[PDB]
Design a binder for these strands. Sequence first.
DNA 1: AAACACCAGAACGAGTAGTAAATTGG
DNA 2: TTTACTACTCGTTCTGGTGTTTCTCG
DNA 3: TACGAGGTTTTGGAACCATTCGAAACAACACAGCTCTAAAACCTCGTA
DNA 4: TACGAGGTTTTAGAGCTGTGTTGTTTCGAATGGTTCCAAAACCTCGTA
Lengths: 289, 289, 289, 289, 108, 108
Amino acid sequence: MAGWRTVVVNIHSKLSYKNNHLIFRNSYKTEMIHLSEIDILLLETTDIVLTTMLVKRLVDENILVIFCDDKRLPTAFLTPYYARHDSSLQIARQIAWKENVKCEVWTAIIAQKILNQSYYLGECSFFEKSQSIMELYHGLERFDPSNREGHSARIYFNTLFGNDFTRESDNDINAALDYGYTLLLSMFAREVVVCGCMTQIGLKHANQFNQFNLASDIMEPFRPIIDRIVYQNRHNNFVKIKKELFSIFSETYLYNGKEMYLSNIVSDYTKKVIKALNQLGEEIPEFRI
Amino acid sequence: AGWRTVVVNIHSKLSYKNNHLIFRNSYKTEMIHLSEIDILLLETTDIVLTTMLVKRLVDENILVIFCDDKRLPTAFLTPYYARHDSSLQIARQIAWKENVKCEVWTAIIAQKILNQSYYLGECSFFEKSQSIMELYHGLERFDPSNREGHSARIYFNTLFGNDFTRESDNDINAALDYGYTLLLSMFAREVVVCGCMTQIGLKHANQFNQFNLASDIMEPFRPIIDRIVYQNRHNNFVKIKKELFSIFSETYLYNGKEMYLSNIVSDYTKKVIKALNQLGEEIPEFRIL
Amino acid sequence: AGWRTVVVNIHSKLSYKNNHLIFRNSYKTEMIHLSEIDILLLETTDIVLTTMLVKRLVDENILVIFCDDKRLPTAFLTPYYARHDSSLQIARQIAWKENVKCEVWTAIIAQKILNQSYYLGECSFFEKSQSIMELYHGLERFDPSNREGHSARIYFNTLFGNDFTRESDNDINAALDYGYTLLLSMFAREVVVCGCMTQIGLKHANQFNQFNLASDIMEPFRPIIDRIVYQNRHNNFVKIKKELFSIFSETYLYNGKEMYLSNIVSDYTKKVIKALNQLGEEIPEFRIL
Amino acid sequence: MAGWRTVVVNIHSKLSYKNNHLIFRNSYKTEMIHLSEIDILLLETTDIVLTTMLVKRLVDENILVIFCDDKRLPTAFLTPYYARHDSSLQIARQIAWKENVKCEVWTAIIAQKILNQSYYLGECSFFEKSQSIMELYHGLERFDPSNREGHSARIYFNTLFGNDFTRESDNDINAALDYGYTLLLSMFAREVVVCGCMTQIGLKHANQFNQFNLASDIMEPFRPIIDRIVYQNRHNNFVKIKKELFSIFSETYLYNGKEMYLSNIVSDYTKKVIKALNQLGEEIPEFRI
Amino acid sequence: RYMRMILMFDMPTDTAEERKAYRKFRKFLLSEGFIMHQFSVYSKLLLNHTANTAMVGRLKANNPKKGNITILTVTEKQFARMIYLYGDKNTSIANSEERLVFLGDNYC
Amino acid sequence: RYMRMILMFDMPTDTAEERKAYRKFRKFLLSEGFIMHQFSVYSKLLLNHTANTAMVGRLKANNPKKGNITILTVTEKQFARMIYLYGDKNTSIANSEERLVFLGDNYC
DNA sequence: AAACACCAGAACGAGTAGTAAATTGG
DNA sequence: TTTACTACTCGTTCTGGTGTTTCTCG
DNA sequence: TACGAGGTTTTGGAACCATTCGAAACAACACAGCTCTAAAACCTCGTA
DNA sequence: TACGAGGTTTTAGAGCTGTGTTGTTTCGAATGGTTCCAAAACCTCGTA
Ligand SMILES: [Mg+2]
Ligand SMILES: [Mg+2]
């Protein structure tokens, strides 16, 4: 059937089938993966050339393949007519999520985000603003009716980029922030569709025109990662900040007491959040910068 | 989102360039504008695709149907994000009332039974048509008496002989199986384009084959395939498939209009979805007369 | 031998190139294909011609009408050799029987008188039309009683007042003079194209103004000019000439057909000549009705 | 009115009007001719540029202008609507030519032709053939019923160019003879239309498709002029014989006991022949080589 | 009614024979009364379908037998519906179908 | 019924801006689905008059504003009457209007 | 794998310019 | 005054080749 | 007091689409023809 | 004899022409609509 490995194709390559093996024929090096060890095949880049023979065999081995677009966002997935992957059942669970468990997990996630913002503000030696954000963290409630997240993200931005700063503006700092946030949103959406759950049903976000509500809800704690990189290179043009922003892929961060790459952190975080929402367990992930 | 149905049978490579489906066989190179293509059907298991073409195909809501080694459909791409306000449509679908769902399912199953009765009437088989019409009146909400099954049984026994059954492995039964998975693909694509989900359907209390809503809406349209399979009962499978491919080129009378099957499917799906989610529409009528 | 009537009013140079009438004014250069041109009319006495263009114009049987200083026609080119078997036609014309000539002249003068009577009838001047019709019956072979003159007298006195006469120098009389020398040119051209000669005509025993045959055949067609001059009796000479130029663009009912004046003239001339030379045709009928 | 000079324009020139003068503005030299001394203006070449002002004035002064085509053959002539040249009356006379006078003049002309052929044959030292042609000349009768002209012509041609020579052949001698005969025919047709008479009514020739019957009838005696030049350069290609044939324009011949250019001889001969046919006089011209 | 006839051609210019054929074909097209709509595109005004049949017969008689040459016949009403994104319409009488043509003062 | 749309353009190439305009216009024409009937002549297949109106609107929006560019819309029946003096008709499906298209075996 | 920019670099398409020639039955 | 021929010479047209870059809310 | 951090509906317009329908247009076919040139007869009757 | 000079009619297609006509296309105007997105409009309330 479907095994354990999730195979992500992010570079130019030709994928072919051979004697129950998937041939990852990348330009740099060629690899072969047995089709029984593959559970999800995620084709995130658009540089990939694949064969119909591979598609047929991956369907027969009950593997889920997910195609993403130029923006590295999930855009389609292959659905067999008869035999289905396990992740499909996840959709049913997403349709039945109790209000209280969503409340609790969203509150924990936004508490992590506020604590992360306070930690970074303290790191940039703005101890008074960090203490103010910490107090607003103590002001948190279920589903944040008092909008502590909004005032925290106002003190955060006015402290980092000056009181004249405003997200609606069209300066280079705002463009860099938007680009890094897009990077994180793409990562979290790709890891959400990998888990089989949808991005259009979120814990708190309910925007009609937003199709990544769950992705945003889960990526909220990770925004300070982008914010720190943007602030560290504030006095630069957008291209330099983008070149520095691409370092989040090849950097390491501390998660679960281990030094992990940020993509693995995002994947494991998403899986644990979905596990907590499924009511299988009540453990909520904790990411702190 | 076009008119051309494109069927590929030969070993080749499919690529993308300037909104075109670049088909480059070793003999010929042949370009098709993406706006024209409506269904792409890859029967041969030797076609070499590229991921950018897949992204661009799902961007234009082009149906892509992959096929097995025996040239039968095995999977098809459905996009994660086909409607801008997809989140709102999914949220409204989750809140579908059971009463409205039952009423609309009763209406569409009555449409199916009535179309079967009319086809038996025009088939010069007058007697069984009256029995199906009588069975239609006995049908009630959610069909407690399984009158839909009785109508299908008499329909099949009258068209293909009393010995014929749906579960038999005879050739014309494989023809109906091929036809129904060609209609189901278009209906699934249209219900996804409507922003809804195929998993949650009107009947079976969300017990999903992942195509519950599409298979429920398809019911009045199955006589279209049944007629083509019936009148070619003598021919072999390849000839029956060739004749089945004529649903993409034949005009049918729907709502006082002579529309092709793609437009009829689209408009019917949209009107059914609007009758369900908002309760602000009338149930459509498709007649095989 | 075409449809376009070309009128030149400005100082310019007319030349020939590749079957085209090269019109090169100091402002504009303008080319007309010789096949399209039917009548070429040079009113201005400043046009500079060339002999090659003259040869090519007479080759295509294009009417060329030169004009005096007062913009009135003064001469026109007629070709020596317009028909291949011109010698045979001239020899047959020389042998025209006096009986056939008298009969055909009686027929055409009856046509003229009848057209005058019909025009007075449609002009809401009912009484004089009956008198002309009565004068028509009194007409006999060669018109001994000069009934043609009496009909013309009542026609002119009824249309333009009793004081009006053909020999007067009033403006609308100059208008008729201009009109009749525009039909006479076309009829002379057509009788030359028929291989015949204009000098030897039906009446006056060959006492020729060099346009005897053309003026004889023109008789039924003079009401065409008389109508246009009559209904514009108020306007000045230039406006009446502008309206007269509409005979080249107006369709007239001839032999149950809506033909332009050029085709009617050609058909009438050819049929009259065939009724004369060979006695193997019927006299044509042109009706102003 | 119209004077005496006939002005022939055979070279490139621009003809303009100025203070009752025609301005022959040839490239080599410019001349001015008073409009009262001009009776006929013959524009034989197609290199001439003329003005509408000249056309108007030439019409007012009652001058006849005759346009010729590329082949230097009369193709058109300007006919005023009202005032006519004297030459027009000639047409009437041509229509009434008695049979006997035409018989006599044609017999004299063909006698001159036969005598000229005999004279040239004697000049080429073929005395026996010359005597045979002279005897056939004695065999002449009215309108040549015994076809002495044909037998004399065959003796002439078989003596000059060998017995194998035939007119229908496509050798260079035949082409040169045809070209020189065309030159003489053009000359005689131009001089016939100058006299006002038509070329389509001949003394003996009655060919329907021939439009220069009278021109041929008059040019018959002058054929030995072309024949002698062709025979003198028999052993040459066609271009050399044409270059030698162009010498007939700039050569001199004895006519009326004077050394005259051949164009003047042709003009005077044509005028005297038409005078003899008009029954004004009975003198017949005599041209002998 | 008045017909209009659009001829579009691509002709090779590699060989001297091909250039001769192109030159002769252009001479023939201009002599028969084709107005240059654009480069390599010509138009002819025909009075009726009889003229169209005669003209296509003449073209087949004078076919250069080189390159890609195509003909499209459209009604004058259809030709008048042509949309001009840029450039100026050719206003010469050769394009017009007016029977009575004035060069100079139109007396109006 | 199916419409066909012929675009004919002559564009200046003297200046670099003009070559920019030509290149961008050709890119746009190819992206919108115009088949090269001939050099400088393109054709597009439209399902109906609504598509024709939308396409002329798009062209006016993307008008290069250089040279002489004209459009003629003719019915598919009218386009099928085109006479080919020489050359070969383009047999690609893009030119044809068949709804059901087979690349390979047509099962017939 | 695809778009977007830049150039070359051959193929088409006309316009201009210089030269030579211009009556092929009766 | 035309035609017929021959270059030449610019404009017009498209294709191939060479880099450079490729996530800008929530 | 205002701004705007965190957000959510609401609402125009913009661009796109497929089928009808009623009157007007159009496309070959069918007519009456027309002109024009070459290729065949035919004549007479000498000279091979 | 036969050919063939001087000629004349006969045909025979070849190319050309304009208008009616009958059924069948064709053209926009109309009729329902469909997504998609960017600009508003609203909430809370904490720091300037
Ligand atoms: Mg071209
Ligand atoms: Mg062009």
